[PDB]
Amino acid sequence: KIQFKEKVLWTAITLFIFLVCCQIPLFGIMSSDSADPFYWMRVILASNRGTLMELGISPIVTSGLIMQLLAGAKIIEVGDTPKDRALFNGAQKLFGMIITIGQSIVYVMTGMYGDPSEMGAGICLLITIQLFVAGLIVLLLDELLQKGYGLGSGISLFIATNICETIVWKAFSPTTVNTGRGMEFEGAIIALFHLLATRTDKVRALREAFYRQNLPNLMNLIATIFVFAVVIYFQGFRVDLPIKSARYRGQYNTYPIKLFYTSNIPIILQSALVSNLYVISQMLSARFSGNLLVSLLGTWSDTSSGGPARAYPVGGLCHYLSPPESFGSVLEDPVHAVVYIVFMLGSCAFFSKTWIEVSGSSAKDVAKQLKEQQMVMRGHRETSMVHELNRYIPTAAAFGGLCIGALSVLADFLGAIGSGTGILLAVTIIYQYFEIFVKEQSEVGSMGALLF
């Protein structure tokens, strides 16, 4: 039944699965390899999900990498094949959903390889079923979110929840600390003010260089502040052009654009996806196939290594598209800095344009809706009413995404979080969902709708 109460419950079940997920998926302990890789991989994956190792929610967005890449390549060659490639944008997304269960699952495991698999013993059994159940429930709900069941806030919401949750856990965990303050509050050593306050009060200000002492903790806070000031500036900015709206006859509503903002969602998505693609392929190439020269198989298969850091490949395209492993405290490499900004930017803009086609917002889709309510025919124009918003949709979309992918790379440089991925993508999602939640709801407010 249609009814807002039914919709909130469907979100609530999905959310409950996430909460349920927070125990389970890990393997926990025994032996084997299920547990989570490195720097990029965790953000997608979402939260704390078996204590330190976050195994669960990774596959859904992983399928979304397949969606973007091909669509902008826009194959024409081979006649029967281009039609299949065009269809692929939707049809592949389901095939991709199959590939991620089939093939991503080895990639999800591999990074925290704990001690070798095939160790054996009866021990696990319940773990073998729980992983199988996880595959069944999350995959079923993912299908239901793309074709009829949700509310506002499906897939994005877990990322939205995850960032806030991650910040408290990093703040409130073991690592290096001399002594607790003697108030551990609701768990460990919570907000950073408590951590500073240990002995007596104060002493943060004393240090080397007016940073060093409490710099890893400090760096995390500033990361948020840098994003905080700039994010709101562009969210506030609006494109007008609704002009004459409401059929003519007098009573009217101005219509806000989706425009630059709708194109913004593919770029923010891009920074997450692009990094994924290189690492999975780099892992695949070594495992699958022998290897003369490093460079010969591929660039980014160039110098596949455990390297200095979790950031495996020390050479190739993948190297540039990861931080220099100091988060901008060394930028006097150059080759690395130059490639990182430019490469991401052009790839993002390409993906902004593919959002237009049949996967998101284009002028033709808008046009039919406008007639139904009668929008004033976009002040006529004849062949207009379609030219108005149509000409300004590729220009707005291409630009719309373009800025942000540069800014994301610069955010790492300015003063990244300790994970250096996980807060950064996730914060961008957290603002976004508030807009989706209430404006779509039509029930004019901003108040409750949690279970209402």
């Binding site: 704390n48 939205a160 929840t161 960032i163 806030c164 949750e165 910040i167 408290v168 856990w169 409130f172 551990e184 509050f185 609701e186 768990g187 460990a188 919570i190 905080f228 709101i232 500036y233 969210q235 506030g236 900015f237 609006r238 494109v239 007008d240 630059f260 220009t395 707005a396 291409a398 630009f399 373009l402 957290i430 603002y431 508030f434």
Partner: protein
Amino acid sequence: FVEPSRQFVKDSIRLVKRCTKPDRKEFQKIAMATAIGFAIMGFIGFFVKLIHIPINNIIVGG
């Protein structure tokens, strides 16, 4: 690359010119909303751990 670049700059100047910023009233409203959003999520994951931790050995009670 020369033809795309001219278009991107031309679009950008119009967009900046368009609005200005979150026009004072808006500036407060969005900023507060983000802070509340961080807090609600932050609160609830944090609360559970209080009960869970001192079961094995009492360190703060729960």
